[PDB]
Amino acid sequence: MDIDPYKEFGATVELLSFLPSDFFPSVRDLLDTASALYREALESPEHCSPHHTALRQAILCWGELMTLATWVGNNLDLVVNYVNTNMGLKIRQLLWFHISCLTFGRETVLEYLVSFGVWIRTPPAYRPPNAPILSTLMDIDPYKEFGATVELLSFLPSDFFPSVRDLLDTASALYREALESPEHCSPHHTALRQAILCWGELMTLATWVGNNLDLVVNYVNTNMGLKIRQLLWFHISCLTFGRETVLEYLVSFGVWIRTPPAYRPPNAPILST
Amino acid sequence: MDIDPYKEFGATVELLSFLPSDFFPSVRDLLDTASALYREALESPEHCSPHHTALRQAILCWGELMTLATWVGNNDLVVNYVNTNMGLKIRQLLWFHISCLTFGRETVLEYLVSFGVWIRTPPAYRPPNAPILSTLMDIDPYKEFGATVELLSFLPSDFFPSVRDLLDTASALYREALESPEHCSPHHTALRQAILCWGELMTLATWVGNVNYVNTNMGLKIRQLLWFHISCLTFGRETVLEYLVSFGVWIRTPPAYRPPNAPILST
Amino acid sequence: MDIDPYKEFGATVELLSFLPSDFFPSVRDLLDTASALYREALESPEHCSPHHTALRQAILCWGELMTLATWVGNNDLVVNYVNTNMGLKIRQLLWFHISCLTFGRETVLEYLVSFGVWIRTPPAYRPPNAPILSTLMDIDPYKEFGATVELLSFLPSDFFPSVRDLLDTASALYREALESPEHCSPHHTALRQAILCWGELMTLATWVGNVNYVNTNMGLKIRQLLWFHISCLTFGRETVLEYLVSFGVWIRTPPAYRPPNAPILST
C-alpha cells in the first residue's frame, strides 16, 4: 500500500515539500504546543476531528520510535542522528500539519503552503523581506476514542493476535481502495493509515540497525510488533465486523480464556461474517 | 486497579489519615458495637444500605485474617504484625461504617474535617477535649444477594478460575466503575471490599514466607466471592441464582445418571 | 503600593494579628489539608472562588521560597530566618484561605474576633479551651485563566520588562483597584498575591546578601506572572491568549522563514 498521510486532508507529500527541511520546529517544540492547546482533547474519549485522530497516532508513533532509539543505544549516538534525519523529519512535518490545521483551519494551512511556495521559489534578489506567516493575528490511549483500552486489548492472550504480515495482507485485500482514498470514510480508516505508515518507519529503522550495526529484529517483534498486531487487528476487525461486535468479543474471548476447560464451550469463540 | 475503600462513601484514605493510628478503638470494641446495634440488619436477607454491605464484608474479612493468623502461630511475633498493618486498616474500616450507620455519613465526613483542625493545632492552643461523635455474629456473605454459602458449596474447587484470572476479569470489564466515586450496585460494593481483602491477605502471606495453604482455605473463599459478583454483573443475578440451582442437581447426581457435560453459565 | 492580602476577603493584617505567631499549623500540616480536601479544585481549569485563586498563588509562592532557601544552604542559619519571617506570613495566608474554604468566610472573621477576646483575657478568667473552628500537588498558575506554563514558555527572557517596570505599570494603572476592598476580577486577585510574593522573595535575597541569581530563576517567573495579568487587564484575556498563540508560531519559525519583526500586543 502506498498511503499518503495527507491525502484525506486535501494535501499531499509533495505539497508539504514546498516548505524546506529546516522550516519545521523540533519535536519538543511541537509536542509542547499540542499539550499547551489540545491536551484535554487529545486525551478525550472522543474522536472530535480527523485531525485529532491523526495527531494521537503520530504522538504514539514517535514514542515507539524513541523507545527503539534509546534501546539500540544501550544494546548495539550514531543511531539517534539517523532518526532525526529520516524518521524525525517525517514526524515534524506531520505534527506541524495537524497542530496548525487545528489552530488555524485546514483551508488556511493549505492556502499557506501555496503562498510559502511562491515565496521560496522566488530568487533571493527579488524575494520580499517578510516570509508568509500562519499567525491568526501527555499520555494517549490509542483505543480510547474507539471505546476500548490497552487493558481490554491485553485481556486477550499475546499469541492470539495474527502476524503483522497477515494483517497487512488483509488490509490490502479488503481496504486498499479506501485506505488510499482521498476521503476519511471512518475514524477507523484514519487510525489504520497511520498504523501502516508507522510500522514502515520502524521497519526502516530496524533494518538500518541491522545493516550498519541481528538482535534488534527479535526485540521489535516482542514489544513494538505486539502493539502493532493488536492495533492492526482492532481496526481491521472493527471495519469488517463492526465496533460494538469487537468490543463484546474482547470480553467474550477473554473470560473464555480464564474459565476452566470443563465448564466452557469446547471451541474458542471467533468472529464470522 | 487501585480501589479506594471510601471513595463511594464520600471520603478518601487521605481524609481518614487525619485521625491518628491509635485513635481507633480495638477490633473487639468495634465488633461489640456492631453486634449490639446492628445484628438483625447485618444478618438480614436485605441490603439495607451500602454501609451495611461494606460492613458485612469487613467483618468476614477480619475472620479470615484471624484464621490465617492463628494458624501461622502454630506452625506471637506475627500478631504484632497483624495488629500493626492489617488490624489497623480493618479498624479504620470498621470504625467508618459503624459511625456512618450511627451518626450518618455527612456527620462523619464533617467530623473528619473537624478532627483534622484539632490535630493540626499546636498544643498550646489546642483545647483539651478532642472532638467526639455524640449527636445521632455469624454473617453469610451471599444472603443479601439471594444466595447462601450452602448454595455455592456444591461448585467444586476446580470450577473457579485463579484469583489472578478473576482480578483481571474485574479489571478488564469493571475497572471504570470499581474505581468510580459511585456505588452503581451492591455487587460493585461487595467486589471492592473483596479485592482489598485479598490484598490484606496476600501481604500477610508474603511476610510470613520471609505457607501457601491460603490457596485452599482463604483463596478458595475469595475465588467464590470474586466469581459470584463478576457473574452477577455479567449475566445478571437471577441468571446466576438459577444456574446454581441447576448445577447443584447435576453435581449431586452420580456418574452414569447425569450427562457428562456440566451446565455452562452464559446468555 | 501597599497591598493588604486580606482586604478583599473582609479581613486585615491587624485582624489576623489577634492570633499569635505559634497558633498557626506548620506549612507541611497546611499543605496536606489543602491536598486532602481541595486538590481537584486547586488543579482545576476553573476559578471556583477568589479563595481558590489566592490559595493557588500562595502554594506556588512557597515553592519558590523553598527553592531559593535550599539553594543558599548549598552556597541552616537561613532556614531559621525563612521560618521566622517568610514561613510565618505564608502560614497565615495558607491558614486563612483553607479555613474560609472549609468553614466559610464569615465564620473565620467571626472566629478572629472570638479568638481576640480569648487571647486578651487575663489567665485567671480565660477558659482552658481556646476557641476552635469545628462547625462547617502540582498547580499551574495560568490554568484557571485559559493559558498554560507551556504556552508562555515560548516568550524569550528578554520579552518581559523589569520587575520594577512591571510594578510601576501595575501601580500607575491599577493601584486604585489593587488596594481596593473589592475583588474586581480574578486577575486582580492573582496580581495582589504576586506583588506580595515578590516582596517576600526580595527581603530574603537582601538578607542573604548581608546571590542575585533570583533574577534568572524566580524573577523570571514573577515577570511572566506580572506581564500576563497586567496585559489581560489592559488588552483583555482573549486578546492575550490569541497573541500568545501567534507569537509562538513566530518564535518556533527559524530565521529566514519568518518576518523579522515579532508580533506586537496592542488594540
Q: Please identify which residue in the block is written with the cell numbers 497546611.
A: C30
Contacts of C32 in chain B (CB under 8 A): 14
- The CA distance from B56 to A188, in Å, is 47
- Tell me which DSSP letter residue B135 carries: -
CB B6 within 8 Å of CB B13: yes
Closest Cα in chain C to B16: C36
Question: Under an 8 A CB cutoff, do A133 and C243 touch?
Answer: no
Grid coordinates given for B66: 484471624
Q: Which of C58, C28, C216 is nearest to C139 (CA)?
A: C58
CA distance C239 to chain A (A): 9
In angstroms and rounded to an integer, the radius of gyration of the C-alpha atoms of chain A is 21
Q: Report how far residue B224's alpha carbon sits from residue B194's, in angstroms, rounded to the nearest whole number.
A: 10
Cα separation of A54 and A191, whole Å? Answer: 7
C73: closest CA among C255, C208, C229, C199? C208
From chain C, pick out residues whose CB is under 8 angstroms from the CB of B17.
Answer: 36
Rounded to whole angstroms, how far apart are CA atoms C30 and B22? 22
Q: CA distances (Å), A132 to each of A14, A32, A114, C156, C248, in order?
A: 19, 23, 10, 22, 15
Residues B190, B53 contacting (CB under 8 angstroms):
yes
What is the DSSP code (8-state) at residue C26? P
Task: Check CB contact under 8 Å for B14 and C25.
Answer: no
Q: Under a CB-based contact definition with an 8 Å cutoff, are residues B117 and B211 in contact? A: no
Under a CB-based contact definition with an 8 Å cutoff, are residues C167 and C70 in contact? Answer: no
Q: Find the largest Cα–Cα distance for chain C.
A: 82
User: Could you count the other beta carbons within 10 Å of the beta carbon of residue C132?
Assistant: 17
C-alpha distance from B201 to closest chain A C-alpha (Å): 22
Residues of C in contact with A134 (CB under 8 A): 249
Cα nearest neighbour of A148 on chain B: B172
Interface contact A133-C258, CB threshold 8 A: yes
Exposed/middle/buried for A72, CB within 10 Å: 0-12, 13-18, 19+? buried
Supply C105's cell numbers: 468566610
The DSSP line for chain A is ----TTGGGT--TTTTTSS-GGGSPPHHHHHHHHHHHSTTTSSSSS---HHHHHHHHHHHHHHHHHHHHHHHHH---TTHHHIIIIIHHHHHHHHHHHHHHHHH-HHHHHHHHHHHHHHHHS-TTT--SSPP---------TTGGGT--HHHHTTS-GGGSPPHHHHHHHHHHHHHHHHSSSS---HHHHHHHHHHHHHHHHHHHHHHHHHH---HHHHHTTTHHHHHHHHHHHHHHHHHS-HHHHHHHHHHHHHHHHS-GGGS-SS------
3-state SS record for C30-81: HHHHHHHHCCCCCCCCCCCCHHHHHHHHHHHHHHHHHHHHHHHCCCCCCHHH
Longest CA–CA span in chain B (Å) reads 82
Which of C151, C248, C257 is nearest residue A23 as measured by Cβ atoms? C257
Where chain C is discontinuous (C–N > 2.5 Å), the residues before each break are 75, 136, 210
User: What is the interface size between A and B, counted as CB pairs within 8 Å?
Assistant: 34
Residues in chain C with CB shorter than 8 Å from the CB of A23 are 253-254, 257
Chain C residues close to A133, C-beta within 8 Å: 249-250, 253, 258-259
